[PDB]
Design an enzyme around this catalytic site. Sequence first.
Site, PDB file in Angstrom:
ATOM      1  N   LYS A 141      64.399  29.082 -17.114  1.00 15.26           N
ATOM      2  CA  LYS A 141      64.643  30.162 -15.815  1.00 15.26           C
ATOM      3  C   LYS A 141      64.286  31.383 -16.310  1.00 15.26           C
ATOM      4  O   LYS A 141      63.929  32.450 -15.643  1.00 15.26           O
ATOM      5  CB  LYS A 141      65.892  30.103 -15.240  1.00 15.26           C
ATOM      6  CG  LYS A 141      66.084  28.464 -14.842  1.00 15.26           C
ATOM      7  CD  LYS A 141      65.096  27.921 -14.130  1.00 15.26           C
ATOM      8  CE  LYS A 141      65.133  26.328 -14.110  1.00 15.26           C
ATOM      9  NZ  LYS A 141      64.131  25.491 -14.044  1.00 15.26           N
ATOM     10  N   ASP A 166      61.308  26.876  -8.282  1.00 12.76           N
ATOM     11  CA  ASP A 166      62.591  26.164  -8.233  1.00 12.76           C
ATOM     12  C   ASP A 166      63.771  26.776  -8.761  1.00 12.76           C
ATOM     13  O   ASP A 166      63.634  27.725  -9.575  1.00 12.76           O
ATOM     14  CB  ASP A 166      62.388  24.571  -8.845  1.00 12.76           C
ATOM     15  CG  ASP A 166      63.631  23.619  -8.269  1.00 12.76           C
ATOM     16  OD1 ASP A 166      64.232  23.890  -7.527  1.00 12.76           O
ATOM     17  OD2 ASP A 166      63.753  22.758  -9.337  1.00 12.76           O
TER      18      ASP A 166
HETATM   19  N1  LIG Z   1      58.130  28.106 -21.753  1.00  8.83           N
HETATM   20  C1  LIG Z   1      57.691  26.774 -21.476  1.00  8.83           C
HETATM   21  N2  LIG Z   1      56.484  26.434 -21.402  1.00  8.83           N
HETATM   22  C2  LIG Z   1      56.289  25.145 -21.053  1.00  8.83           C
HETATM   23  N3  LIG Z   1      57.171  24.118 -20.884  1.00  8.83           N
HETATM   24  C3  LIG Z   1      58.386  24.537 -20.636  1.00  8.83           C
HETATM   25  C4  LIG Z   1      58.735  25.914 -20.984  1.00  8.83           C
HETATM   26  N4  LIG Z   1      60.182  26.007 -20.846  1.00  8.83           N
HETATM   27  C5  LIG Z   1      60.618  24.927 -20.554  1.00  8.83           C
HETATM   28  N5  LIG Z   1      59.611  23.806 -20.378  1.00  8.83           N
HETATM   29  C6  LIG Z   1      59.617  22.521 -19.999  1.00  8.83           C
HETATM   30  O1  LIG Z   1      60.102  22.788 -18.546  1.00  8.83           O
HETATM   31  C7  LIG Z   1      60.888  21.638 -18.291  1.00  8.83           C
HETATM   32  C8  LIG Z   1      61.783  22.018 -17.316  1.00  8.83           C
HETATM   33  C9  LIG Z   1      62.102  21.083 -15.983  1.00  8.83           C
HETATM   34  N6  LIG Z   1      63.179  21.498 -15.017  1.00  8.83           N
HETATM   35  C10 LIG Z   1      60.813  20.554 -15.463  1.00  8.83           C
HETATM   36  C11 LIG Z   1      61.047  19.626 -14.138  1.00  8.83           C
HETATM   37  C12 LIG Z   1      59.882  18.872 -13.502  1.00  8.83           C
HETATM   38  N7  LIG Z   1      58.999  20.244 -12.741  1.00  8.83           N
HETATM   39  C13 LIG Z   1      60.169  18.309 -12.363  1.00  8.83           C
HETATM   40  O2  LIG Z   1      60.793  18.402 -11.425  1.00  8.83           O
HETATM   41  O3  LIG Z   1      59.760  16.812 -12.694  1.00  8.83           O
HETATM   42  C14 LIG Z   1      61.307  20.923 -19.468  1.00  8.83           C
HETATM   43  O4  LIG Z   1      60.867  19.606 -19.705  1.00  8.83           O
HETATM   44  C15 LIG Z   1      61.031  21.839 -20.617  1.00  8.83           C
HETATM   45  O5  LIG Z   1      60.883  21.434 -21.932  1.00  8.83           O
HETATM   46  C1  LIG Z   2      72.286  22.592 -19.343  1.00  9.38           C
HETATM   47  C2  LIG Z   2      71.870  22.376 -18.096  1.00  9.38           C
HETATM   48  C3  LIG Z   2      72.201  23.177 -17.134  1.00  9.38           C
HETATM   49  C4  LIG Z   2      71.900  23.513 -15.888  1.00  9.38           C
HETATM   50  C5  LIG Z   2      70.694  22.523 -15.376  1.00  9.38           C
HETATM   51  C6  LIG Z   2      70.282  22.637 -14.001  1.00  9.38           C
HETATM   52  O1  LIG Z   2      70.924  22.442 -13.245  1.00  9.38           O
HETATM   53  C7  LIG Z   2      68.647  22.666 -13.907  1.00  9.38           C
HETATM   54  C8  LIG Z   2      68.063  22.147 -12.664  1.00  9.38           C
HETATM   55  C9  LIG Z   2      66.656  22.450 -12.515  1.00  9.38           C
HETATM   56  O2  LIG Z   2      66.074  21.696 -11.154  1.00  9.38           O
HETATM   57  C10 LIG Z   2      66.165  22.751 -13.817  1.00  9.38           C
HETATM   58  O3  LIG Z   2      64.457  22.947 -13.351  1.00  9.38           O
HETATM   59  C11 LIG Z   2      66.487  23.125 -14.773  1.00  9.38           C
HETATM   60  N1  LIG Z   2      65.735  23.802 -16.118  1.00  9.38           N
HETATM   61  O4  LIG Z   2      64.374  23.485 -16.369  1.00  9.38           O
HETATM   62  O5  LIG Z   2      66.516  24.547 -17.095  1.00  9.38           O
HETATM   63  C12 LIG Z   2      67.964  23.048 -15.085  1.00  9.38           C
HETATM   64  C13 LIG Z   2      70.345  21.431 -16.564  1.00  9.38           C
HETATM   65  C14 LIG Z   2      70.746  21.307 -17.697  1.00  9.38           C
HETATM   66 MG   LIG Z   3      64.388  22.594 -11.370  1.00  7.62          MG
END
Ligand SMILES: Nc1ncnc2c1ncn2[C@@H]1O[C@H](C[C@@H](N)CC[C@H](N)C(=O)O)[C@@H](O)[C@H]1O
Ligand SMILES: Cc1ccc(C(=O)c2cc(O)c(O)c([N+](=O)[O-])c2)cc1
Ligand SMILES: [Mg+2]
Length: 213
Positions: A141, A166
């Site tokens: 985030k 998101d």
């Molecule tokens: N700076 C970054 N560059 C590329 N990938 C990243 C980065 N930071 C986090 N990620 C990947 O972003 C993903 C975060 C997930 N919430 C993505 C979920 C996916 N968009 C879904 O809803 O199916 C994780 O698998 C991370 O390893």
């Molecule tokens: C340790 C932890 C804390 C909060 C969440 C969490 O709620 C969350 C939800 C998402 O849709 C999302 O995209 C991510 N993310 O990529 O970090 C985290 C997930 C894991």
């Molecule tokens: Mg998400």
Amino acid sequence: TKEQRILRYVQQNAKPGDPQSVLEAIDTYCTQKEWAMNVGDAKGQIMDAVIREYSPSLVLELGAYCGYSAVRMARLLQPGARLLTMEMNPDYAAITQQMLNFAGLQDKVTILNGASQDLIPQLKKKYDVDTLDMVFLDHWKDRYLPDTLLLEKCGLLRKGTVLLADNVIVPGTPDFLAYVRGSSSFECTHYSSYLEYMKVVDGLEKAIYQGPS
Ligand SMILES: Nc1ncnc2c1ncn2[C@@H]1O[C@H](C[C@@H](N)CC[C@H](N)C(=O)O)[C@@H](O)[C@H]1O
Ligand SMILES: Cc1ccc(C(=O)c2cc(O)c(O)c([N+](=O)[O-])c2)cc1
Ligand SMILES: [Mg+2]
């Protein structure tokens, strides 16, 4: 790994070549067994709505994870439309490919293994990208605002480029949200929903790029 578990669960319970069953099995498993940071069905239905509205030819996804949103978006992609997705975790990226392979969506999608901050400046160069029609922000985030500035800086946005972010409430992207709302370069709309697999209020922000000042 949790992600192997999900992939295997889909391979066993979903129908190959059927993106819907892929999604539904992924959701059933995370609802009933292991929570996972998939965008999930409630917010996903809003994604679907936004995709159907703008029919992007080129989408960039930041954060592929297990491929749930990539499958979610790709199935709505027109013929010839391309989704590009960035995933820095090599394990996750291998899982995402398998999922998209299983969904028969692998030809609509290109997985880019690397950090978004590293990959974004090479998009035009290595991937023949002019500007993005749509961007889905769903990675760490703290990267939403920086990668937005980078996307803008690298000339990857045009007038009407849609950013769809998101988790702007939970876990939350307050700096990004403050920035796009305050900037004249972005028209924003908030879509209130719920955190995947729970009663926590979360939302998606749509931020449409207006061009520079
Ligand atoms: N700076 C970054 N560059 C590329 N990938 C990243 C980065 N930071 C986090 N990620 C990947 O972003 C993903 C975060 C997930 N919430 C993505 C979920 C996916 N968009 C879904 O809803 O199916 C994780 O698998 C991370 O390893
Ligand atoms: C340790 C932890 C804390 C909060 C969440 C969490 O709620 C969350 C939800 C998402 O849709 C999302 O995209 C991510 N993310 O990529 O970090 C985290 C997930 C894991
Ligand atoms: Mg998400």
